Amino acid sequence: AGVKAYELRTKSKEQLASQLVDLKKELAELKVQKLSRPSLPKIKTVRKSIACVLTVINEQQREAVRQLYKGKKYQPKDLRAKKTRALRRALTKFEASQVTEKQRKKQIAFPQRKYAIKA
Amino acid sequence: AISKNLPILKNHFRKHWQERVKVHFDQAGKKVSRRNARATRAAKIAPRPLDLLRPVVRAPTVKYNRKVRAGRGFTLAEVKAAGLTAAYARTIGIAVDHRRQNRNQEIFDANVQRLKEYQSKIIVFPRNGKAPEAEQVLSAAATFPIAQP
Amino acid sequence: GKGTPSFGKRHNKSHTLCNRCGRRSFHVQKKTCSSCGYPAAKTRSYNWGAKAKRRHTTGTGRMRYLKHVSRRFKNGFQTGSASK
Amino acid sequence: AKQSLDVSSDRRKARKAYFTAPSSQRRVLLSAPLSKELRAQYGIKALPIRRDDEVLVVRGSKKGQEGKISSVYRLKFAVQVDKVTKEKVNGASVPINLHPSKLVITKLHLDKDRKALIQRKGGK
Amino acid sequence: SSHKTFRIKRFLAKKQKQNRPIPQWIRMKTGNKIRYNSKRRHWRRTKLGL
RNA sequence: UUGACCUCAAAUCAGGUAGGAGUACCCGCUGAACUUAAGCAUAUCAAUAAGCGGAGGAAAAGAAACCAACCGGGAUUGC
RNA sequence: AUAUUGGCGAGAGACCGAUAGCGAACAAGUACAGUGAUGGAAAGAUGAAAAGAACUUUGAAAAGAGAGUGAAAAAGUACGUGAAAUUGUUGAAAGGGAAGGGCAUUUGAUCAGACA
RNA sequence: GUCGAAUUUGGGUAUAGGGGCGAAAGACUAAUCGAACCAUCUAGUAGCUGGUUCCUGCCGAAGUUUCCCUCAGGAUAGCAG
RNA sequence: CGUGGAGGUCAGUGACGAAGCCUAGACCGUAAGGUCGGGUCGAACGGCCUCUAGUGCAGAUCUUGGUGGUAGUAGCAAAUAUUCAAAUGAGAACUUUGAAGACUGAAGUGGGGAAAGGUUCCACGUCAACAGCAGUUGGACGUGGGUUAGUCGAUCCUAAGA
RNA sequence: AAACUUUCAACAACGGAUCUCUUGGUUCUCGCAUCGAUGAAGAACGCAGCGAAAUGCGAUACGUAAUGUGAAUUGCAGAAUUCCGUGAAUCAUCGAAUCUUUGAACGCACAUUGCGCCCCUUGGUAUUCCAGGGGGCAUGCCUGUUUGAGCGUCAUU
Ligand SMILES: [Cl-]
Ligand SMILES: [Cl-]
Ligand SMILES: [Cl-]
Ligand SMILES: [Cl-]
Ligand SMILES: [Cl-]
Ligand SMILES: [Mg+2]
Ligand SMILES: [Mg+2]
Ligand SMILES: [Mg+2]
Ligand SMILES: [Mg+2]
Ligand SMILES: [Mg+2]
Ligand SMILES: [Mg+2]
Ligand SMILES: [Mg+2]
Ligand SMILES: [Mg+2]
Ligand SMILES: [Mg+2]
Ligand SMILES: [Mg+2]
Ligand SMILES: [Mg+2]
Ligand SMILES: [Mg+2]
Ligand SMILES: [Mg+2]
Ligand SMILES: [Mg+2]
Ligand SMILES: [Mg+2]
Ligand SMILES: [Mg+2]
Ligand SMILES: [Mg+2]
Ligand SMILES: [Mg+2]
Ligand SMILES: [Mg+2]
Ligand SMILES: [Mg+2]
Ligand SMILES: [Mg+2]
Ligand SMILES: [Mg+2]
Ligand SMILES: [Mg+2]
Ligand SMILES: [Mg+2]
Ligand SMILES: [Mg+2]
Ligand SMILES: [Mg+2]
Ligand SMILES: [Mg+2]
Ligand SMILES: [Mg+2]
Ligand SMILES: [Mg+2]
Ligand SMILES: [Mg+2]
Ligand SMILES: [Mg+2]
Ligand SMILES: [Mg+2]
Ligand SMILES: [Mg+2]
Ligand SMILES: [Mg+2]
Ligand SMILES: [Mg+2]
Ligand SMILES: [Mg+2]
Ligand SMILES: [Mg+2]
Ligand SMILES: [Mg+2]
Ligand SMILES: [Mg+2]
Ligand SMILES: [Mg+2]
Ligand SMILES: [Mg+2]
Ligand SMILES: [Zn+2]
Structure with missing residues (x-):
């Protein structure tokens, strides 16, 4: 599973912010379940999804600043x-x-x- | 440490000489590099002869004054007698040496003759950019050898 | 009493951990490291100590940034991104 | 004989490159020749081995047996055939590792990328 | 002693976690030559020397 | 009073720059003794090791206040 | 045009072959020692493939005896080959304060050469 | 032996190698002191001690002369191949 | 004569067994050595003509590693001291419980701390190695648990000094 | 006569020589010129379903994005839809990012995870007290801006 970077690039910052919070909530509850089960490899794909969302958010904010400083010395x-x-x-x-x-x-x-x- | 009838030796090896030993293992490799450098320079630079024309001068000292060799460059008076300026001569492949003087008429006449023959055996391409392709001669020294008078 | 009886009085450290190099070589009273020379700006080193240089020279660590310089030079310090 | 300065004949370097080859490069090293029927049909000699490919064993004690590729064990430089196994004393069965150079491909698993590779090599 | 700085306690914590036997499943990996942990430490035999 | 000039300061003023590492090779400073002389002090080891400052892909040198005494040669570097 | 025991990328040898070759062919500037500056090792090889010995039996157990796997357990994770010092068992021989050696022959054991 | 003081002692701090410290023994300065420890110069020099790895064949010595801060060493002549 | 490597040659030997190793078995050479049979073993190696050297060990209080006689020997004797029964266990002079006899005798073999050590603290499981006898026990081995501050300290102040 | 001692052989011990093997070392040659205040070299502490070390990485933590290849990874478990496809991979490439505490190390300090100041914002009935989040405050020097100092000094009141 896991989110797709090219799919995340077609939504606004508000949608990315909301999706980041939901992934964090899902990560928290999976850590609770890990304490009782011998193994839980599903926790890996949630962590990578958070990293991917943070990457796309950063590239959108940095791109906006480049337009602000476009042409200036x-x-x-x-x-x-x-x-x-x-x-x-x-x-x-x-x-x-x-x-x-x-x-x-x-x-x-x-x-x-x-x-x-x-x- | 002196015994028997032997010559006195003067081998200078009382310093740390082993730290400064240079063996030319790359003698063959450097020859390949020099040939590559000459080949790539000739292709890169121009159909130019890869070297500049040199005058004929008398070697100094009473031991070597019986022979003539190649000098550094033609004098300002020599190039003036040939009907050209020093600035233009450098761009056509003629070495100019401003600090050499002329006191021998025979040497002066010989160097003037060399400049005359050089201008008659070269083609200067125009600056427009047409530049018709010509065969490249790699050695102007071989084309104009120096002979003992 | 200079041997075994004297060894029983050793309970005060002369050196502690150094903040720059991590060795137990930071002299407490002199406030200086005997290995790397901290807090001096330069790192302590000597040409008579050939082995000491080898233990701490470049390449003994991670090289977090210097690793990728050769790759970036090989590509000519490109800017932008790869085309699809 | 060697004619290029960029290729080395050093035995030590060649063996190190083989044993430390990454996964992508081991795929090329694990190639198998096609059968006579497939060689004439497609017009190519050999292809890299692929899962779900029908093969025939032509060397070793397992000569004559057929099957489908169930695993390409690149880390071990070997492949495994579904019905070519060994029975342990306790009753359990383990796969037998085979080298693709000792096999012959009798049927190819085809998709968009495989067909383009065949046409890229001049095949039909 | 009971009085200890944060740096010393953090240093002691890492040394405790590094003092454990090698997991069994690691020895079953392909091309594995590691049998026992050669950096094992006991508090009475070898001192940390911090 | 007012307004210049000169010199000298301040600011988390606007924009920059220097430090450390590496150091095989390169440009300087500083600077031994073991050793050899069958002893030893000048000498030698050596204008070397160690120590200190400063660069680059090369550095440095370089278009003569040069060499010569010849019928003169003609920036520098290397063999 | 000259220099280069550093850095990066390559090609090579009448070089060394695990006490050699760099200190390091291995989780080596590691383990470990010293208050400290510093000092600094040892350690490579089952088999083509774990097929790493199911099962039976004795023993509290480690293990043994069988069985089995393998071309080979005279390859069993103390693993290729397995020398010497040193040691056990079996067999032969000698020995009244050393033992060993040289020349010659008796006795015992053992052995090649021609049957032309 | 001494035991209320020139007393005993913890911790902090100062003095570093031809330097320190010494109610003074050339004592002490991390089991190291009539000049600590560590690395380098350094494979420092030695007329002095020890060692110096296969076989067979032929030939086969000298401890004497002269000079030397020469007397456990060299040069020189002799003996030898 | 022998050893590592190199040029040439013998269209040399070899998984139907190369090299190595063992062999009071055989043959050749005055000798350095060479050749063969048998056993063990498993992948390379030799003759001849020449080239080359990090080329031959009994010694150096030689270097590194391994192993003996000594020898089942010296010894395992300071700190007053142990005994009976039951429980557990394959196994108890040494573990647990009960009983008895004793000691430290408040400047303690008692009850807390500074420095130093760093999980040795506690429970469960467990005995190959370690506790110079033993071991079912342990500061050992394996897996887990455990250190809670507005008032106790650090933090603040200044001392010799840096 | 045994035991014992010694010599040799076979088998078994002890030990790791010898032979063969080699992803290492060493030397020569060729080509290239790229560290750091845009925070380097180095250090500390962390990060995996099951990891101590090595290797990789930084709370986006044995990785994120992008490009290429085109189906693995593998000790086990798991995930499977990722399989005629914007797509498997401990793969390759790498131009976008992240980059804890440090370190020339830069608010002041540091044997302390010690102590300040400024700006924006949020909560506690608050410009002043307390707390959370974000952004800042080292030194020498150069050019410029601004605010100044001195009967050093000019002109005019
Ligand atoms: Cl503690
Ligand atoms: Cl190395
Ligand atoms: Cl030390
Ligand atoms: Cl000092
Ligand atoms: Cl012989
Ligand atoms: Mg002393
Ligand atoms: Mg002190
Ligand atoms: Mg230095
Ligand atoms: Mg323990
Ligand atoms: Mg202790
Ligand atoms: Mg500013
Ligand atoms: Mg210089
Ligand atoms: Mg002298
Ligand atoms: Mg002398
Ligand atoms: Mg003297
Ligand atoms: Mg120097
Ligand atoms: Mg540079
Ligand atoms: Mg150059
Ligand atoms: Mg220059
Ligand atoms: Mg001039
Ligand atoms: Mg000149
Ligand atoms: Mg070695
Ligand atoms: Mg065999
Ligand atoms: Mg063996
Ligand atoms: Mg023996
Ligand atoms: Mg005296
Ligand atoms: Mg001492
Ligand atoms: Mg010597
Ligand atoms: Mg004779
Ligand atoms: Mg003598
Ligand atoms: Mg054989
Ligand atoms: Mg024998
Ligand atoms: Mg084999
Ligand atoms: Mg030798
Ligand atoms: Mg011998
Ligand atoms: Mg010997
Ligand atoms: Mg001898
Ligand atoms: Mg000896
Ligand atoms: Mg006894
Ligand atoms: Mg006794
Ligand atoms: Mg007693
Ligand atoms: Mg009493
Ligand atoms: Mg009593
Ligand atoms: Mg306890
Ligand atoms: Mg015991
Ligand atoms: Mg026992
Ligand atoms: Zn330090």
Whole structure:
């Protein structure tokens, strides 16, 4: 058994919140029954369903915030790209390709040429 | 530790020499790497000859002054006598050395002749981008060998 | 009386558990660990102690984050998600 | 002979890869050849073994016996046949582990994925 | 002693739970070479040394 | 009174940045003795071990206040 | 173009073969020792497959004697092969304060070679 | 022996290795003290002691000369292959 | 002469039994050694021409491991001391109950704690190992149960000092 | 003459040599350049139907989401509809998340699971007391903003 992530993505936050509470109630009563029975493997599928519901709720809330900060130059650090510490401090593509006006004139005037030794 | 009629030896092994022993096990491997690097550079760069034209100079010292060899680059006066500028010469595959001077007319004439022959045996493609395909000669030094006068 | 009779008076700990490395090496009165050097900012280590470095170096633990760096580098630090 | 630098002939490496292969890769390793009737009918030589496949034993002391695959024991590199078992002294019966390379498939269990695999291998 | 810090008591709790024999059903697993718990402890033989 | 300038402070002010780890190889500082001299102090071991500071995929060096005395050579690195 | 006993990914050897090779082929920087800095092991192999011995009998029981499984229990979870020191049983021989050895032959036991 | 004091003692705290502490014995400083313990330099050097693994065949010594802080060691000549 | 590994060769040997091991059985060599039969055993191994070395042990108060004589020997003698019966059990000098004789004699062999130990506390089940005899008993083995604070401490204060 | 002692053989002991085996070690060569305040390396404590360790993981706890493969997992139990399919799996891949207490470790402390302050919100007849939930408060330095200090100093009243 267990819930399906793609099915949970088609409902509002209110429905997800209510379904989370019901799963928690079902988990609580199964723990009571575990004390009297030699085994109860059904408790596993309930725990995974709670994890799946929490995952879908988090991805909906995080997606909403990305729309709020869309286009702005400052965004929360958890919504920024991870990469590495050294990669985030490196010069951007625009900064690394900057040249002075003096050097730009030289590059246009005398670029590397294409030639061959035939005749 | 001195006995018998033997030469005096001067083997310098009183330091921790075993920590600094370099055995060239990769001699064959490095040759493969160098050949791969030359092959990939020739394909990558251009149909260009993979090396720059060099002038002929006189070796210094009384022991070696009887022979001529390849120098670093053509002088500013040599390239000027050939009808081109130093900046343009570098982009066509001519090495230019600004710190070498000309005092020998024979050497100056020989280097001018080399520049003349080089310009007549190359094709400079236009900057438009047509670039007709041409056969790539991998060695400009082999095309223009240096001969003892 | 310096042997067996003296051994009966040992009931006061000189070291307790260290909060940084977990060993029973935190000197009570000196307020410093004899193994990792806590609370000093750097971790205590010495080149003459080759074995000591091996016991605590990188790779002896879980490597919770450093495990996945090689995989992320191999894919070029991708962003987004896989396409269906 | 070997002609690629990406493949190794080291015996030690080959044995470690076999014994530590994950479950998905053991499926390919547990392949069985088809019968003459099925080889002509489909046009392929061998396929990975699948549950609910009819097989015939062609090697060992159980040669000549048939049955259906009831379990593919990937962890043990073996399969089990429903009616090929051994009777213990106490009266209980245990399955006999067989290697798929010593079997011959006489009937294939077919679904959407199996049919696509057959056509992918050039079969009909 | 009766007076003990929380850290010591938490440390003692884990050592109690780790002091148990291996379950029998584990020895029946495929490719199992473990027979007895080699890290068993008795309070009078080996001291924790905390 | 008012308004500048200079210098110097404060703020949970706006946005950033440094620490620790690893350290085979790399750039510096600091720095022994056993040992050899058939003793031993200069010397040697050695501008080494240990100790301390700082980087990268390489580092460092690098387009001559160079080498030369030749009919002169021509950034640096390595064999 | 040079360096690289670290990290990641590969290909190899006239290298070692469980007292060897890294300390570690195994729940090894583990068990354990030290107040502490530190110190630091031992330990791989039933069989193709547990088919890991139902059942009967003796004993309080462990187990034994049968039966059975297996190509083989001279493979029984003290498990491949199973050497020596050392030990039990059986058989033969000698022995008045050591034993063992060399040359020669008697006695006992045991044995190859040609029957041309 | 001493037993109301220069008394006995728990815990807290201070002093760390050519340093500490000492009503002073070179005593004590975790069974370690006329200079603790741990790792490294380090496989430190030794003219000195011990050991140095198969067979057969042929040849076969020296303890003497000169020099040496040389006298349990070397160089040198001799004897040997 | 022998040992580990390498090139070549003998279209060499082998599950109809390779290697190893045991064998007062046989044969060859002055010797280092080589060959064969029998037993045990189960998967690889040898002759010859050459190459190579981490290549041959009785010793080093040698290293690691294993095992002897000594030897059923030294010994299991401080702290006054045990005895009868019943119950249980395969089994009782040592367990339980009852009876008797004794000791600690309030600076105790009594009743609580600090430090230190860490589940040794309690019940049930159980005896291969451990309790230098024994064991049905146990601080042993197996499975469970158990530590309840506005007032008791920590927490707060300051001491030498850090 | 026995016992006893010694030597040899067979069978049985003790012990683990020898032979064969090898998912390990060692050395050489080739390619690549990627840790951390966006909280690293390391440490502590927890998480499975039945688990002590190892391995994996973090109260979403031997895992969640996504993608691929296309029917297992396996010691037992269980679940079965998951089987011509948005779908089995201790599978592979991995770009989205979770990530307890810590640690350069950052409100102050730490041999204490000790003690404060600020903002929003909820309950207790409450801006002040008590409690629950969420979000914050380290240091050096750089650029900028704002609020200031000094007869250091200018001009004007
Ligand atoms: Cl307690
Ligand atoms: Cl390893
Ligand atoms: Cl120690
Ligand atoms: Cl100190
Ligand atoms: Cl011989
Ligand atoms: Mg002392
Ligand atoms: Mg103290
Ligand atoms: Mg250091
Ligand atoms: Mg116990
Ligand atoms: Mg004790
Ligand atoms: Mg701010
Ligand atoms: Mg340097
Ligand atoms: Mg000297
Ligand atoms: Mg000397
Ligand atoms: Mg001296
Ligand atoms: Mg150094
Ligand atoms: Mg880097
Ligand atoms: Mg480079
Ligand atoms: Mg640079
Ligand atoms: Mg210049
Ligand atoms: Mg130069
Ligand atoms: Mg080893
Ligand atoms: Mg056999
Ligand atoms: Mg055996
Ligand atoms: Mg024997
Ligand atoms: Mg004196
Ligand atoms: Mg001592
Ligand atoms: Mg030596
Ligand atoms: Mg002679
Ligand atoms: Mg002598
Ligand atoms: Mg044989
Ligand atoms: Mg014999
Ligand atoms: Mg076999
Ligand atoms: Mg040797
Ligand atoms: Mg010998
Ligand atoms: Mg020996
Ligand atoms: Mg000898
Ligand atoms: Mg000895
Ligand atoms: Mg006696
Ligand atoms: Mg006595
Ligand atoms: Mg007594
Ligand atoms: Mg009395
Ligand atoms: Mg009395
Ligand atoms: Mg009790
Ligand atoms: Mg006893
Ligand atoms: Mg007993
Ligand atoms: Zn520490």
